[PDB]
Amino acid sequence: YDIQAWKKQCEELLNLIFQCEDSEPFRQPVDLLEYPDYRDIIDTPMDFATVRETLEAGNYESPMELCKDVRLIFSNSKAYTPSKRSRIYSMSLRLSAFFEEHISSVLSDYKSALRFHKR
Ligand SMILES: COCCNC(=O)N1CCN(C(=O)c2ccco2)CC1
């Protein structure tokens, strides 16, 4: 029933993601000097440092909003990859499974707590 607990839970999950080698490609913005066409394909860049800064700034209201931005990291990788067997895309899929496994209880607890609050 703690409707604020999602924020520390998301901080801790981001800490786990940053320790994970599969987050290597996703920790900071794509450099257009390395990938000159990146913004020709990707409309809305996202990375985990941006997600963490948004959280720490107090600019997420709910864990659903954070989840939308994290999912955008993964959909950007799927859109940019020239192969479904690329190194970086393959890393994105494992990291996505990890994130979804861990965010499930954060979303459930928040939605439960908020329903209780509004009862
Ligand atoms: C060390 O990380 C530097 C920042 N990241 C980065 O440059 N990226 C990450 C996003 N990305 C892809 O998802 C992708 C799919 C297939 C090839 O790349 C493009 C490359």
Curated annotation (Swiss-Prot):
Signal peptide: none
Quaternary data: Interacts with IRS1 and IRS2. Interacts (via bromo domain) with acetylated lysine residues on histone H1.4, histone H3 and H4 (in vitro).
Function per UniProt: Probable regulator of the insulin and insulin-like growth factor signaling pathways. Stimulates cell proliferation through regulation of cyclin transcription and has an anti-apoptotic activity through AKT1 phosphorylation and activation. Plays a role in the regulation of cell morphology and cytoskeletal organization.
Residues of the full protein shown: 1316 to 1434 of 1821
Compartment annotation: Nucleus
Residue numbers carrying Phosphothreonine: T44
Positions bearing Phosphoserine: S90
Free-text tissue specificity from the UniProt record: Expressed in myeloma and epidermoid carcinoma cell lines.
Illness the protein is tied to: Chung-Jansen syndrome: An autosomal dominant disorder characterized by developmental delay, intellectual disability, autistic features, anxiety, hypotonia, obesity, and dysmorphic features.
Name of the featured protein: PH-interacting protein
Gene name in the database record: PHIP
Domain Bromo: 1-106
